[PDB]
């Protein structure tokens, strides 16, 4: 709706810096690692598919978990509790029909009570001070997508998928902003599917070039090449679905020749 297209892009650029989690964080959590987190985000992916949630809800919940864990140490036994209250907050925020709290207690296999999930819900809101409208990778991709010629649904799903892949690994994806991961994701997809590259108009729009997108893009490319071997597979499975044009079955380029 190009009356406000640029204004929003701008505002989201400013907000993505304020909602950035801290890059180190995991080093300060005595009882958790980047691997358990990966285990957790993979699980939110299946919860999203089990309950049929938007990919947006999924991006927001991970943003809530990362910010929450930038400031609260948590024991390994409560990580899923945090993850679950996050998913619920994201759903209430983003979904037309959020799953019910009990359903959230139910996919944990009664690991937590309704009471604990509700109490967790409230602490997450306190800790985030209700700043829930966070820019995500999904929201940048969607805008970048208006820049296609012509639109290409395989391109769209594959960018979404690469962007989803980046949610799984804090090292190194925490060090990049959502708009940057989205550029690297959009470019890889375009290039993988059609051989085209990050377009001039997205340069005028974002101020980013392949040169500025390079680092994240080098990481995102290894992530994509290594994806079949990753301990987490829910996103790949997920993306074998025709809802997503089965794009996880495509083959990554061996080189990106930059």
């Amino acid at each position: 709706v190009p009356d406000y297209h640029e204004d929003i892009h701008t505002y989201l650029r400013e907000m993505e810096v304020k909602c950035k989690p801290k890059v180190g964080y995991m080093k300060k959590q005595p009882d958790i690692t980047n691997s358990m987190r990966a285990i957790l985000v993979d699980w939110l992916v299946e919860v999203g598919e089990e309950y049929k949630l938007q990919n947006e809800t999924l991006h927001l919940a991970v943003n809530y978990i990362d910010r929450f864990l930038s400031s609260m140490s948590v024991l390994r036994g409560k990580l899923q509790l945090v993850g679950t209250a996050a998913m619920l907050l994201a759903s209430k925020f983003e979904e037309i029909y959020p799953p019910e709290v009990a359903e959230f207690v139910y996919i944990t296999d009664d690991t937590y009570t309704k009471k604990q999930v509700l109490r967790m819900e409230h602490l997450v809101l306190k800790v985030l001070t209700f700043d829930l409208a966070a820019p995500t990778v999904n929201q940048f991709l969607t805008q970048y997508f208006l820049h296609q010629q012509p639109a290409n649904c395989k391109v769209e799903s594959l960018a979404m998928f690469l962007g989803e892949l980046s949610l799984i690994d804090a090292d190194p994806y925490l060090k990049y902003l959502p708009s940057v991961i989205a550029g690297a994701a959009f470019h890889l997809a375009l290039y993988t599917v059609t051989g085209q590259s990050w377009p001039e108009s997205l340069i005028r729009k974002t101020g980013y070039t392949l040169e500025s997108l390079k680092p994240c893009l080098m990481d995102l490319h290894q992530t994509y090449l290594k994806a079949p071997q990753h301990a987490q597979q829910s996103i790949r499975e997920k993306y074998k679905n025709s809802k997503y044009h089965g794009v996880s079955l495509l083959n990554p380029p061996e080189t990106l020749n930059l």
């Binding site: 358990m36 919860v47 990580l79």
Partner: peptide, 9 residues
């Protein structure tokens, strides 16, 4: 299965 408490130890 989704229905599962995640194991981490």
């Amino acid at each position: 299965p989704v229905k599962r408490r995640l194991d981490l130890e």
